[PDB]
């Protein structure tokens with residue numbers, strides 16, 4: 136997250152921190168995800184496409200720090216890693232960038248709600264906030280495009296939804312963005328998601344209900360003029376989610 140503010144897990148209790156084991160046993164951060172139900176975390180396919188093996192991943196819930204445990208956090212194994220079969224990757228635009236991870240602890244249990252662990256509601260089909268609406272994003276991604284390290288403390292910021300016509304414009308992303316995608320950014324391009332934030336949630340208040348409107352997917356650089364963050368439009372993949380869950 137470029138700009139924005141630091142936060143702890145209680146301000147995004149459905150945020151999931153996903154890591155991967157390497158040969159030798161070293162563990163590195165992979166991407167963010169969102170708990171949509173006790174046993175299910177939704178993320179982005181591009182995060183796992185190069186390493187499809189579910190056994191290599193570890194998922195944490197109620198975790199506020201990148202490399203240090205958070206009191207009360209839960210650790211999970213990935214019982215099933217479901218990627219979207221229609222996934223595609225272009226110059227930058229990832230299509231159908233959505234994935235599902237079925238979590239299971241070593242005790243064979245799913246998530247246990249608490250003050251630091253809760254689920255986020257899915258939107259109604261094809262029901263998104265009006266463009267210009269302010270929503271929030273969360274993640275452990277870079278704080279600066281040139282940074283080498285990722286922040287140790289979770290972060291969040293606010294970005295406004297951009298209309299498809301605006302984003303489809305030449306100056307923006309042209310045709311790289313589709314109806315199954317949502318663009319969002321700061322009117323001053325001061326804050327935005329960045330490398331490491333993929334898979335994370337774009338949450339909007341829709342009719343008094345915090346809703347998982349999008350999933351951090353892609354973008355040209357970070358916090359650059361006319362280059363918004365692009366998000367998987369969740370309200371357009373409900374049938375997919377339904378069946379796979």
Ligand SMILES: N=C(N)Nc1ccccc1
Nearest residue numbers: 328329330353354357364
């Ligand atoms: N918001 C962005 N400009 N770029 C971006 C970078 C990395 C992941 C997701 C989105």
